[PDB]
Amino acid sequence: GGGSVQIVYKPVDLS
Amino acid sequence: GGGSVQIVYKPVDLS
Amino acid sequence: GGGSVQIVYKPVDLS
Amino acid sequence: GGGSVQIVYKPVDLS
Amino acid sequence: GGGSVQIVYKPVDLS
Amino acid sequence: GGGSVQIVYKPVDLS
Amino acid sequence: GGGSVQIVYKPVDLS
Amino acid sequence: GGGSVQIVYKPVDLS
Amino acid sequence: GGGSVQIVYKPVDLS
Amino acid sequence: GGGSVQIVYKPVDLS
Amino acid sequence: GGGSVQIVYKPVDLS
Amino acid sequence: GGGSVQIVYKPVDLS
Amino acid sequence: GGGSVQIVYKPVDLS
Amino acid sequence: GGGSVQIVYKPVDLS
Amino acid sequence: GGGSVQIVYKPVDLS
Amino acid sequence: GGGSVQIVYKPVDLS
């Protein structure tokens, strides 16, 4: 098994 | 198995 | 097997 | 097992 | 603008 | 604008 | 098990 | 601009 | 178990 | 501008 | 068990 | 500009 | 400029 | 236990 | 410029 | 200039 990449991406735009 | 990429992408737009 | 890409994409638009 | 990369990315834009 | 995800995925099988 | 996902996917099979 | 990299990344832009 | 994720993913399977 | 790298990265931009 | 994440991921599987 | 590296990185830009 | 994260990830599996 | 994080991650699994 | 490294890094840039 | 973090992480697993 | 942090991390697991 060649490993793992996990990404949680949650940009928030205000005003 | 050549590895793995997982992405959770949840942009939120407010006002 | 050449690995894997998994994406969950859930944009939310508010007000 | 080829290790693991985990990223939480939450940019915030204000005013 | 809720950001961007860009992915280049080029699996190679040899021999 | 709910962001953007862009993927370039080019698997190669040799020999 | 080849270890682990964990990143929490939260840039803040104000005014 | 809500930031950016860029990924280059090039798994190689040999012999 | 090949150890562990943990990073908290929170850059802040003012004025 | 909410920063940037760049990843180069190149697992190699041998014998 | 190969230990641990923990980093808290919080650069501040003013004026 | 909210900084930058760069990762080079190259797991190797042998025998 | 909000600084920089650079990581080179190369786990090696043998025998 | 292979020990521990902990780093708190907070550069502040003024004028 | 808010400084810099550079990490070279190379865990090795034997026998 | 906000300085620099450089880390070389090479844990070795045997028997």
Author numbering:
A (entry chain F), B (entry chain G), C (entry chain H), D (entry chain E), E (entry chain O), F (entry chain P), ...: 302 to 316
Give the article text.
Cryo-EM structure determination revealed the presence of the same filament at 120 min in the PHF and CTE reactions. The FIA adopts a pseudo-21 helical symmetry and has an atypically large, left-handed twist of −6.3° (other known tau filaments, including those described in this paper have twists between −1.65° and −0.77°). The ordered core of the FIA comprises only residues 302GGGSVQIVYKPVDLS316 from two antiparallel tau molecules, with a predominantly hydrophobic close-packed interface. At its centre, the side chains of valine 306 and isoleucine 308 from opposite protofilaments pack against each other and are flanked by the side chain of tyrosine 310. Whereas the β-sheets in the crystal are flat and stabilized by additional crystal contacts, β-sheets in the FIA are twisted and stabilized by additional hydrogen bonds between the hydroxyl group of tyrosine 310 to the backbone groups of glycine 303 and serine 305. At 120 min, 100% of the filaments that yield interpretable two-dimensional class averages are FIAs, but they are no longer observed at 160 min.
Residues 297–391 (using the numbering of the longest human brain tau isoform) constitute the proteolytically stable core of paired helical filaments (PHFs) from the brains of individuals with Alzheimer’s disease.
